[PDB]
């Protein structure tokens, strides 16, 4: 068409993940290619491409289209002469257990456009990012590459995050209080290692900002409600810049290098938070707080601060100068002290009217536990029943973007990341030729069903060394 | 009761672990923010009275003036006022955790566990 | 076997207290002790060993197979010339009413690998520890 969508790319499109669609472009999906095979057999429908360069496949994925994403990974057609166009094949079944072959060739981080470098660093406006890795290969295909040579590397990286915040660390609790902040290394052992400390810093610091700018105006450029769905890669920007804001102090004489070293070292420590991307059930506890200080803090405390500078400035106007906490922030901070648990109710005699000055601050107390109530109960009432559900699945997507991240940070090599499936053949072409392709693994089993089903690729079951093939129709 | 104490004994094997490593990093994080910015010139400046300040926010009593001897007030503050709010967030999911994750069986799931654990 | 296990030590073991296989191996459980009744009628198949020691209703508290644990001790078998086999015996039943006997042979601590004595002290490797402990005659 005008766009250059095919058939396929149209059926994709046109589904809503609805059960109706679902059921329905799943069928019509299958026919036409089931027809396009009969019809001429060598059209790769699947493999054509829009203007836009994607796939159907990448189509699906890309818009978030679930269903459809389900039937084109896991299909299995029985009818045989088109059989080549099948993924879920089956190997070995002895019985009711069945061992699978969820087919790889576009959606591994070895083409362009594979889907899973499409599902994690798409837009939050493509619905049900989430549920689309809870797929049946999608969701073993990264907890393995987890539990292989990524669990490793990034382990080792949490290692290296913590040098650098003992050290930044270091560096400061052992500033010199002096004069102004060049400092003129005086010579000892400690001070060696103290402009040791600082130099580690900022070359590390500098490091969060290159690969901040790699993500920002370069690979994932992001726009503004982006950058805040993509959480975490601004406060490891953000740190960087108070750093390289508190570097460029140092050497302007002026001494507040120490206020953005500060900053920059309290997101830093509240930033080894990050690397529970690990650890599962912490990695959910962590994403509920990216949660509520996105949806659920910029609601609350414009209504708490209204309170608080409301019944606070009623507080300043009426006090009258004869202590002195007539200024108004001395007063705001008052009623912040209320609700942490000091509060006085007796802060200044220096009132005029006594009653009008405790009404006010018992029903600054009263509505700000009206008010902490229902930060509670809305949370609740609104979420609960399925946070835990959600979190989870955040969390898995927030693990498979650190996993494809990783692999990016391998070249081209590949050599121990092409995902097993080691050119497995699973049966021949349309022609004659073999159908060698990469397939990950699945064993399962069916106790109801016996697993009789058509498509056997192994006579003698099992994978060892030495695997003998089927007369699977040659 | 032993349903009672069954509770204590499942979060302190599952729901501790995670939580302190979470608020030791704000603490030791936000502390050892305040300790760098204060100058000496009582003498809260080491690291271990520092902590304890920001572990007594928590229980209930918070000074936010518990030294004038810093430089840079609004520096200050605003980690105090972010430590304080952060753990509010972060006492708040612990709660809200608890229960999305595992309300809906406890009374059943303790229950069997008592039963074993008598037995 | 090579490790010992019988018929109904495997039975025992291939289920995972799914529907379908407690369904199943409930009723294949039942016909060959029924058939080893008839066949051989002293063969005490409930009473073998494996080379680990467990008995099959041990391998299946030990391993953790509720479903099946139900069935070894509350079953009933109402067909003549195997009625021996049972456990859930009915004494006394004045219309409403009936008086149950659940046996106790192989479950109280005067045997070596008594199913209490394995599900309580065995592993938290072993699922459902808890829910074995409400079936029927164990809870009470
Ligand atoms: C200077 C150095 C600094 C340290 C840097 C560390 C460097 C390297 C780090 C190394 C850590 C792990 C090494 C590998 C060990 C196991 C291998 C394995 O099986 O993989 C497992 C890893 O293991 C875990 O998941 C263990 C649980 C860790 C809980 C979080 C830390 C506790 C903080 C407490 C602080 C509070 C103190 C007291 C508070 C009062 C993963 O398998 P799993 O099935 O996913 O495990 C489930 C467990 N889970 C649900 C918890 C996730
Ligand atoms: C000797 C003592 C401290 C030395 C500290 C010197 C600076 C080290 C860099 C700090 C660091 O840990 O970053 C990386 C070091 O990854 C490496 O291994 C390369 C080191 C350069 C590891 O962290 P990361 O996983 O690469 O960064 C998170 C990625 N994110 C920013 C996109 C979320
Ligand atoms: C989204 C926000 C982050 C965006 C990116 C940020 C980019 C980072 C780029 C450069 C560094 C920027 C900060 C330091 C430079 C200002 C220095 C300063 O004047 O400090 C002031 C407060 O400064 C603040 O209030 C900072 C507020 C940031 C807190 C973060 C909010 C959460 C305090 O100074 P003072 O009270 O006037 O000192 C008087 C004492 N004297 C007389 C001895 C001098
Ligand atoms: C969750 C966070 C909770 C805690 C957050 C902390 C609470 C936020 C805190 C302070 C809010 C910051 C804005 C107000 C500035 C206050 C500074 C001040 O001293 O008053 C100023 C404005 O005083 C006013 O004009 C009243 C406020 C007018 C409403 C605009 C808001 C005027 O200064 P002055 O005192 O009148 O000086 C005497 C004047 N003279 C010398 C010129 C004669
Ligand atoms: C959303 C919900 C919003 C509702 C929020 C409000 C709900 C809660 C409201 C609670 C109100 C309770 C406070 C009462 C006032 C203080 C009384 C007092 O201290 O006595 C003072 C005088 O005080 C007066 O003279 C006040 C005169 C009566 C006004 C009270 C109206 C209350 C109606 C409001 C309805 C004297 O102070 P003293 O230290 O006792 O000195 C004793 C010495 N002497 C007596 C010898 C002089
Ligand atoms: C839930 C529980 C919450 C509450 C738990 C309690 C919070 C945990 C508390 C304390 C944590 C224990 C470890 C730090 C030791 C502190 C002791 C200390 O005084 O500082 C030491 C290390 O100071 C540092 O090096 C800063 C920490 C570096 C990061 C490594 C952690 C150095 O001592 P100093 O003060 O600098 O002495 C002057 C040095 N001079 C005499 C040699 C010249
Ligand atoms: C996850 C959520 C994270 C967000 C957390 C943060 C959210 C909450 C943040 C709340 C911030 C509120 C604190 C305001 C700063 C203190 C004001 C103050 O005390 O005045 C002091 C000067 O202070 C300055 O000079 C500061 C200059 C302006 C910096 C404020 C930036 C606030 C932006 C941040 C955004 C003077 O002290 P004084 O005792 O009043 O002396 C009065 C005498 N005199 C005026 C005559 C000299
Ligand atoms: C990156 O990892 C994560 C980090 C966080 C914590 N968020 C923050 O960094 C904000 C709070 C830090 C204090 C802010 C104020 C300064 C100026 C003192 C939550 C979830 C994550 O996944
Ligand atoms: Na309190």
Same mark, same amino acid.
């Given at each position: 068409?005008?766009?250059?969508?095919?058939?396929?790319?149209?059926?994709?499109?046109?589904?809503?993940?609805?059960?109706?669609?679902?059921?329905?472009?799943?069928?019509?999906?299958?026919?036409?290619?089931?027809?396009?095979?009969?019809?001429?057999?060598?059209?790769?429908?699947?493999?054509?491409?829009?203007?836009?360069?994607?796939?159907?496949?990448?189509?699906?994925?890309?818009?978030?289209?679930?269903?459809?994403?389900?039937?084109?990974?896991?299909?299995?057609?029985?009818?045989?002469?088109?059989?080549?166009? &099948?993924?879920?094949?089956?190997?070995?079944?002895?019985?009711?257990?069945?061992?699978?072959?969820?087919?790889?060739?576009?959606?591994?981080?070895?083409?362009?456009?594979?889907?899973?470098?499409?599902?994690?660093?798409?837009?939050?406006?493509?619905?049900?990012?989430?549920?689309?890795?809870?797929?049946?290969?999608?969701?073993?295909?990264?907890?393995?590459?987890?539990?292989?040579?990524?669990?490793?590397? #990034?382990?080792?990286?949490?290692?290296?995050?913590?040098?650098?915040?003992?050290?930044?660390?270091?560096?400061?609790?052992?500033?010199?209080?002096?004069?102004?902040?060049?400092?003129?290394?005086?010579?000892?052992?400690?001070?060696?290692?103290?402009?040791?400390?600082?130099?580690?810093?900022?070359?590390?610091?500098?490091?969060?900002?290159?690969?901040?700018?790699?993500?920002?105006?370069?690979?994932?450029?992001?726009?503004?409600?982006?950058?805040?769905? &993509?959480?975490?890669?601004?406060?490891?920007?953000?740190?960087?810049?108070?750093?390289?804001?508190?570097?460029?102090?140092?050497?302007?004489?002026?001494?507040?290098?120490?206020?953005?070293?500060?900053?920059?070292?309290?997101?830093?420590?509240?930033?080894?938070?990050?690397?529970?991307?690990?650890?599962?059930?912490? @990695?959910?506890?962590?994403?509920?707080?990216?949660?509520?200080?996105?949806?659920?803090?910029?609601?609350?405390?414009?209504?708490?601060?209204? #309170?608080?500078?409301?019944?606070?400035?009623?507080?300043?106007?009426?006090?009258?100068?004869?202590? &002195?906490?007539?200024?108004?922030?001395?007063?705001?901070?008052?009623?912040?002290?209320?609700?942490?648990?000091?509060?006085?109710?007796?802060?200044?005699?220096?009132?005029?009217?006594?009653?009008? #000055?405790?009404?006010?601050?018992?029903?600054?107390?009263?509505?700000?536990?009206?008010?902490?109530?229902?930060?509670?109960?809305?949370?609740?009432?609104?979420?609960?029943?399925?946070?835990?559900?959600?979190?989870?699945?955040?969390?898995?997507?927030?693990?498979?973007?650190?996993?494809?991240?990783?692999?990016?940070?391998?070249?081209?090599?590949?050599?121990?990341?092409?995902?097993?499936?080691?050119?497995?053949?699973? @049966?021949?072409?349309?022609?004659?030729?073999?159908?060698?392709?990469?397939? #990950?693994?699945?064993?399962?089993?069916?106790?109801?069903?016996?697993?009789?089903?058509?498509?056997?690729?192994?006579?003698?079951?099992?994978?060892?060394?030495?695997?003998?093939?089927?007369?699977?129709?040659?």
């Amino acid at each position: 068409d005008s766009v250059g969508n095919t058939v396929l790319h149209a059926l994709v499109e046109v589904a809503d993940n609805t059960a109706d669609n679902t059921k329905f472009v799943t069928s019509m999906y299958n026919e036409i290619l089931i027809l396009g095979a009969k019809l001429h057999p060598t059209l790769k429908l699947e493999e054509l491409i829009n203007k836009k360069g994607l796939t159907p496949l990448a189509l699906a994925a890309s818009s978030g289209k679930i269903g459809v994403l389900a039937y084109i990974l896991q299909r299995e057609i029985q009818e045989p002469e088109c059989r080549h166009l &099948s993924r879920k094949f089956t190997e070995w079944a002895y019985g009711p257990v069945h061992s699978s072959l969820y087919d790889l060739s576009c959606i591994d981080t070895c083409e362009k456009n594979s889907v899973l470098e499409v599902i994690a660093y798409s837009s939050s406006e493509t619905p049900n990012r989430h549920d689309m890795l809870l797929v049946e290969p999608l969701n073993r295909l990264l907890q393995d590459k987890w539990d292989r040579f990524v669990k490793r590397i #990034f382990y080792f990286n949490f290692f290296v995050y913590c040098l650098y915040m003992i050290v930044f660390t270091t560096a400061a609790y052992y500033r010199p209080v002096d004069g102004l902040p060049p400092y003129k290394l005086k010579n000892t052992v400690g001070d060696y290692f103290r402009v040791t400390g600082e130099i580690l810093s900022v070359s590390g610091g500098v490091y969060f900002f290159l690969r901040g700018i790699q993500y920002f105006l370069q690979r994932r450029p992001s726009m503004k409600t982006l950058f805040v769905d &993509s959480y975490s890669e601004m406060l490891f920007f953000v740190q960087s810049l108070f750093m390289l804001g508190s570097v460029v102090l140092y050497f302007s004489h002026r001494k507040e290098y120490v206020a953005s070293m500060v900053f920059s070292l309290a997101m830093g420590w509240t930033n080894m938070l990050y690397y529970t991307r690990g650890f599962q059930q912490m @990695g959910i506890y962590a994403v509920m707080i990216e949660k509520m200080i996105l949806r659920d803090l910029c609601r609350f405390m414009f209504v708490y601060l209204v #309170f608080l500078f409301g019944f606070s400035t009623a507080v300043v106007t009426l006090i009258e100068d004869g202590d &002195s906490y007539n200024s108004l922030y001395s007063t705001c901070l008052e009623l912040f002290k209320f609700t942490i648990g000091m509060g006085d109710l007796e802060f200044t005699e220096n009132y005029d009217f006594k009653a009008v #000055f405790i009404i006010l601050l018992l029903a600054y107390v009263i509505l700000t536990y009206i008010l902490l109530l229902n930060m509670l109960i809305a949370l609740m009432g609104e979420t609960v029943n399925k946070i835990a559900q959600e979190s989870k699945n955040i969390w898995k997507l927030q693990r498979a973007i650190t996993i494809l991240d990783t692999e990016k940070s391998f070249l081209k090599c590949m050599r121990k990341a092409f995902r097993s499936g080691k050119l497995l053949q699973v @049966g021949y072409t349309p022609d004659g030729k073999d159908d060698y392709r990469w397939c #990950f693994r699945v064993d399962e089993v069916n106790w109801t069903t016996w697993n009789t089903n058509v498509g056997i690729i192994n006579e003698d079951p099992g994978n060892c060394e030495g695997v003998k093939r089927t007369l699977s129709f040659s």
